[PDB]
Write a protein that binds this ligand. Structure first.
Ligand SMILES: Nc1ncnc2c1ncn2[C@@H]1O[C@H](COP(=O)(O)OP(=O)(O)NP(=O)(O)O)[C@@H](O)[C@H]1O
Length: 283
């Protein structure tokens, strides 16, 4: 059973309850669909002077089929340091990712190989499945959510939160069940995974119209040519991910069939998880 768990309070192990007067607004890190993400400096305690990202929502919940904030911790998922509420607003204090997003870093290279992309998709698959083993669905997977740390490793900017902006959803990566509105599943995550792999590999989106409606009819119905310049294993993985019907889609029966795909044959997953696999690029 899906159980939503509201996010009202969270103090990272060993630390004390935080509040807005312990932080220092410095800069606007970016703008996301649910409002701005800020840069703050903590002025207090063992981590006084530490830089964090801060998200300011009206409310947020975590829908989990079946501490959940301590179990979501992952090498490639942004870490929650503090969560609190003041004056009708929920504050989210998280890791400051200094790498920028992946797509930009890719744009600062004249070219890259399928290997380079493969690194990112491998780490990403690890994080996604880590959320899936916990009954969490990422729901909104996009490039703006995939950033890099200081080394070049992947870090997702959220972890399946159901959120609500305070100042009173990306169709391009929606699976056809989500456009038809039959609910987010982990298989939908894998569809979006496939769209991210397609864009990172061709520099183009598979489906995109003049409006959001056209993009939806395209996702549901349009033809999609297979880019011939792709390796047999990349084309294989892609066509295995682009199943309009979930449970027919790869990944709907675990991540294991994904990790064992020919495309990822030269990837040691234990070394990847332990971040002993060097990034293609330093940010
Ligand atoms: N921890 C972080 N460190 C550095 N930059 C971040 C961090 N979190 C978000 N950003 C930047 O702020 C922007 C918003 O990211 P995001 O976390 O998607 O905001 P959001 O609106 O809460 N999520 P969504 O509504 O799904 O887009 C992104 O373009 C990131 O570059």
């Amino acid at each position: 059973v899906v159980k939503e768990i509201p996010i009202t309070h969270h103090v990272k192990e060993g630390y004390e309850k935080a509040d807005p007067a312990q932080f220092e607004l410095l800069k606007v890190l970016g703008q996301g669909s649910f409002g701005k993400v800020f840069l703050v400096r903590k002025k207090t305690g063992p981590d006084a002077g530490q830089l964090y990202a801060m998200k300011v929502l009206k409310k947020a919940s975590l829908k989990v089929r079946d501490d959940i904030l301590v179990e979501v911790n992952h090498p490639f998922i942004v870490k929650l340091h503090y969560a609190f509420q003041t004056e009708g607003k929920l504050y989210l204090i998280l890791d400051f990712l200094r790498g920028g997003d992946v797509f930009t870093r890719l744009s600062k290279e004249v070219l890259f190989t399928e290997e380079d992309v493969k690194f990112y998709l491998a780490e990403l698959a690890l994080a996604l499945d880590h959320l899936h083993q916990l009954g969490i669905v990422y729901r909104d997977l996009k490039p703006e959510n995939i950033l890099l740390d200081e080394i070049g490793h992947i870090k997702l900017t959220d972890f399946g939160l159901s959120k609500e902006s305070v100042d009173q959803g990306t169709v391009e990566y929606m699976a056809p069940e989500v456009v038809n509105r039959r609910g987010h599943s982990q298989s939908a995550d894998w569809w979006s995974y496939g769209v991210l792999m397609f864009e990172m590999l061709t520099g183009t989106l598979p489906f995109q119209g003049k409006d959001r409606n056209e993009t939806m009819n395209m996702i549901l119905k349009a033809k999609l040519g297979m880019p011939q310049f792709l390796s047999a294993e990349a084309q294989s993985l892609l066509r295995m991910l682009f199943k309009r019907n979930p449970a027919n889609r790869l990944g709907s029966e675990g991540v294991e069939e994904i990790k064992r795909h020919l495309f990822f044959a030269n990837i040691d997953w234990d070394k990847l998880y332990k971040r002993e696999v060097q990034p293609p690029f330093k940010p």
